[PDB]
Amino acid sequence: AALVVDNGSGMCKAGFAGDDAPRAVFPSIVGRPRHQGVMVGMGQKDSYVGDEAQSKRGILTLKYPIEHGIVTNWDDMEKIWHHTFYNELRVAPEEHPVLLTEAPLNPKANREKMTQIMFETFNTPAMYVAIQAVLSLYASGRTTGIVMDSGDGVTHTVPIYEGYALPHAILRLDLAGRDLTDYLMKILTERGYSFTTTAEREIVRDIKEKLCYVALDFEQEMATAASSSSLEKSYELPDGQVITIGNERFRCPEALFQPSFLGMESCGIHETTFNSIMKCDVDIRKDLYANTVLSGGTTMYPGIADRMQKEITALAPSTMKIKIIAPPERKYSVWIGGSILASLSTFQQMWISKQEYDESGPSIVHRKCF
Amino acid sequence: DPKYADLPGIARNEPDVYETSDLPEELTSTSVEHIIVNPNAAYDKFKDKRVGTKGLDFSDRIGKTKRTGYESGE
Amino acid sequence: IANQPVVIDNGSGVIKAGFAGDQIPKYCFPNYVGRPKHVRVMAGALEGDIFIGPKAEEHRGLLSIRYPMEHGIVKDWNDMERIWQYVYSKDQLQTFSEEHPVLLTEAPLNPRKNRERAAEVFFETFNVPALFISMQAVLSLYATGRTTGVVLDSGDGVTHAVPIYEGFAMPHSIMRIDIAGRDVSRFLRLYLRKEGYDFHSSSEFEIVKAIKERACYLSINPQKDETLETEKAQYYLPDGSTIEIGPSRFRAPELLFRPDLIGEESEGIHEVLVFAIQKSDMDLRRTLFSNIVLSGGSTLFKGFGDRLLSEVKKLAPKDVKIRISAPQERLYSTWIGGSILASLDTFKKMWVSKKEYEEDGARSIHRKTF
Amino acid sequence: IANQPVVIDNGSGVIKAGFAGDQIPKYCFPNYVGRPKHVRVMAGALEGDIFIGPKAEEHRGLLSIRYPMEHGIVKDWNDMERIWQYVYSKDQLQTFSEEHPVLLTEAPLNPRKNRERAAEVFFETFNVPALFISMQAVLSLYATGRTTGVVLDSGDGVTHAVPIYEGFAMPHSIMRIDIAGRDVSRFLRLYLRKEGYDFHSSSEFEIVKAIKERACYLSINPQKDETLETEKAQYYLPDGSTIEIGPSRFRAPELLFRPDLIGEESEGIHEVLVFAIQKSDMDLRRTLFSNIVLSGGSTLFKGFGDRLLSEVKKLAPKDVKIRISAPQERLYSTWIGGSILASLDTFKKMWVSKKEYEEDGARSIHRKTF
Ligand SMILES: Nc1ncnc2c1ncn2[C@@H]1O[C@H](COP(=O)(O)OP(=O)(O)NP(=O)(O)O)[C@@H](O)[C@H]1O
């Protein structure tokens, strides 16, 4: 009996260890109303969470507590965990031990405060933090190979050989799904369709998920998109109003491969994977080329694998064979790894108990990382 | 002055600028021996020193046994 | 053609016309068309059904005001063509659009269709020899006579902050908010109705604007002026009737610095300035704080600079010199900038000929914009 | 030749240039080419797309920094040639390259292709009368005024130790490692991200270099100070923001003594010095321990002499006199040596003439260079 709770900046995937899919999946967001001194009606909650905040977008100011995979507002983060445990899962944190997920090369303060809250506030019997990239290997049952776990906050590439990580080869990029949404809003406004407010930002994100796809040849696709109006598709808003996205449809995801558009002054996601392999040992490079895994929900763009294959192949040697591993279920690949690891009898020893926390302190999390 | 004197929508008898008040080790270690560099003295010491550059070739050529560049200062 | 260029400031409130040789804009009139309130089918009534500038001022009570431009965007193009035809009339300037070139002042981050359609009018409706659209923020710096400087241009339709260093405009740090002078007049009309003075007619909206322009002071401490009993300063209407403004005078513009009070989802005028500087590189941030320039008409409010300096100082880093160098002619700065730019020999290369527009197409205006 | 020879110290961090006989290098500027990343909009703005030396230092925020040479190996030759052109320009020496002979000072055990191409430029692009390339270690001895001594020259790009006895150099006992000052700056940046301070931009990396120089001490016992709670020493950034460096001050520079921290299979700086001596003949080993000369900027860390002497004493034989000598002008020692050697009449015979290069070619440089 154990709980797996992924602390994603976009979506919170929670469930019991051994389960195939997460039980409770909701957006990690807090919505507080823009209330004036004028009297309000009955059934009014001071702060809404998840589906409720998504339903009442009109009045509620939506503030993500996690910014670039870092918890900015810890008080709101506790309210997300409180809704997750008590309301969504319908389980006491005192009963089951909780498996948590961290991004690589995160600030040390996150682990320190994380463990304090779970043991002190929630009084959990045990808590273990795991690397998202390491868990995704358990989902694929592969000890060797690199993973490109691209989230809403950040994107990172962690190469692991025969279940041994190369810490020097780990690369972190702040470019992620949330930055793409803000880019799409700007270029849609230039077309004519203006989106300013927090509620409108969420509507544009829902539009992005439906229409946007990755082009194989960016210049040729834009040249063809300029010529013909076959790619131009219509989208119906919550209001009767209908919009035509046009050439901007496939323009948004290009920023991942060419960050110069957003102005990141960094290398593309395909260059990050290649650069990481170059930092890795010469012998194991062959196996990393053979096992390039794509993880997270930011790699669910249609035809991203086709563009990735072309770009990596160009960078890689001509003699070398480059194989990209893109399973249908990438979105829940990190959580499934957590469920498999938590289910494994070996992991039973890895749990940090309340007694161990009290004796050692919050510094115990830093010792039992890797 | 006459330019904005004619115009109606101009600031008159107001301050132009709104601004805030103007607000006004290893080389000294004991373990290492500290040397003062005097290039004039160094030149005088090495001034009359010469080298023999005849037959000079530092390169990784195998032929003709071992070589030592700069034979003498004769 | 060698003939002097005609500068036209595309202000949502008042259009400012004149030649590049002129030191000041000679012709400044409200940017709206006045039509009779009653729909006139019979003869012996007001003929033409178009009153612009002083003609509208003469028959103000009889006519109904409709602004063709909202938040720096043209809604009714037919009305705007009549206004631009009035710019090239016998009444104002009295010159041929075929002889003299034109310099336009388009707001930043507008839809591409608005820019393309605006250009089409001056080439198709008007047979202009040459046309050049320029950036409002850049022109303000030519007027002031400095290359480096932050330009906080608070207009009637739009408020935007552009940081420019050594004649380089950072496109990523630019911030635009729709809450401008026009909204304060709308909010004051609401507050005046809360005082017990109704302004039902569109003509009475101009009297709310007149009250704001005459009597509107920004308090340093709003709680002391709210607690203190007001003098209740009377304003005299053209008819002779008096209005007691009272606390509505100073507690109306508060929404510029605190728009969350009424319930408008925006940062605020003091916030947009600070954030725009924070986006820039660490090396330039200190120079941008030491060089701030106020532009637009919504800076003429009594005690604006005093309140702004205090609000910026609290947000800005400690022990940093903050110099807000306001000119006396903030309202007319943008047009003077255009006159200077047009006067420069570099402009000769900048503008696009009518013949080039006929051959190249519409795209021409986008490539030469920057 | 009547025209004085030009000394060019091609360092990874800063290039030191001047004429032979000069007491100190007159012209010292950073070794990188800065290109403007932001768009030029205004007329009268900064001219040129290339900024080198004090112009790049003044307007750093606008520019993107790019080092042409890494570990004493020219990566981009086009950029390196332009910097050598800058040395001769009106801002720097302001002299003709064809009139003055040149003295180049490269690091030991560099690739032959680098030396060959570097020389080609000074005979083909520049019509130099004669070129002589010299070793860094040999020049340091002319500055100190000693024929016998071990020269541990830890630079920004490369760290090497060359034992030389009474003028004689043992080429087989020379030890070279790529890890140098620039790697510690990158390694410190890793700790700043872990503490929670982001410095992504090429300009922000130069601030990290300034932070390293200001606040970093070398611990006598690393494990002791690592465990003990560190005082959070505050540093003020150019904009005004304060950062707490804390334990990263001493944990970052440790890389010099422990290359396993980054994960490179190389010897520590303390092992390089002793190992280089141990390779030398049994008779001379005691004299080489007696005559140890420190050089390079990477020895300027507080407690370098104390830590090095402790590490050398442990590795060195028992009952041996270990005297470590530090010139007061550690940074300028290499250049001063060049000026002293260049001023000598024996230097005339050492030259490779333009005519000699044209006849023999690349062979002449390999034959006459050491
Ligand atoms: N089918 C799709 N098409 C386009 N974009 C998508 C698609 N699916 C996901 N995304 C983008 O990817 C982002 C994150 O994916 P998501 O499905 O939230 O996985 P996630 O693991 O919850 N991310 P995180 O919140 O960091 O855990 C979304 O916010 C979208 O921008």
Ligand SMILES: Nc1ncnc2c1ncn2[C@@H]1O[C@H](COP(=O)(O)OP(=O)(O)O)[C@@H](O)[C@H]1O
């Ligand atoms: N003296 C004043 N005091 C207060 N508000 C003023 C004053 N003069 C003008 N305004 C406000 O500013 C507006 C003028 O904006 P303006 O500077 O003409 O914009 P633009 O730069 O687009 O031409 C008016 O409509 C009014 O709302």
Ligand SMILES: Nc1ncnc2c1ncn2[C@@H]1O[C@H](COP(=O)(O)OP(=O)(O)O)[C@@H](O)[C@H]1O
């Ligand atoms: N006070 C200091 N403390 C620590 N490191 C320093 C200090 N001053 C300079 N450095 C380091 O030394 C470098 C200078 O290297 P330098 O000796 O000039 O190179 P080279 O010998 O290759 O010409 C700087 O870039 C920096 O990394």
